[PDB]
Paper text:
[name] is a small single domain protein of 64 residues, which has been extensively used as a model to understand key concepts of protein folding and stability. L49 and I57 are both part of the folding nucleus in [name] and very important for the stability of the folded state of CI232. Here, we have applied an efficient in-cell assay in E. coli to select variants of the barley chymotrypsin inhibitor 2 with increased stability.
Instead, the most abundant mutant after selection was I57V which can be made by a single base substitution from the Ala codon. As I57V is more stable than the wild-type this demonstrates the efficiency of the selection system. Relative to the wild-type, I57V is stabilized by ΔΔGf = −2.2 ± 0.1 kJ mol−1. Overall, the structures of L49I, I57V and L49I/I57V are highly similar to the structure of the wild-type with RMSDs for the backbone of 0.16, 0.45 and 0.17 Å. The Val at position 57 in I57V and L49I/I57V superimpose, except for the missing δ1 methyl group, with the Ile at position 57 in the wild-type and L49I. Analysis of the pairwise interaction energies at the residue level suggests that much of the stabilizing effect of the I57V mutation originates from an unfavourable interaction between I57 and Q59 that is observed in structures of both the wild-type and L49I.
Numbering used by the authors: 1 to 64
Write the structure that this text describes.
């Protein structure tokens, strides 16, 4: 199972969603500002995108 998407740093949310859904059709994609604190529970189906002021992916997306 692919768990990380280093190739998406710098890319838009639209691009990131297209790629993650190709790779991971069940993905629940969540978009948060960089630095947002999340709760600890694990979801194998979730991929969070931490984005910058311009809605570009700012750090490597991972499952969880």
């Amino acid at each position: 199972m692919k768990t990380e998407w280093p190739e998406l740093v710098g890319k838009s949310v639209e691009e990131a969603k297209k790629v993650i859904l190709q790779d991971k059709p069940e993905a629940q994609i969540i978009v948060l500002p960089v630095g947002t604190i999340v709760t600890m529970e694990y979801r194998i189906d979730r991929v969070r995108l931490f984005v910058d002021k311009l809605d570009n992916v700012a750090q490597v997306p991972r499952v969880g």
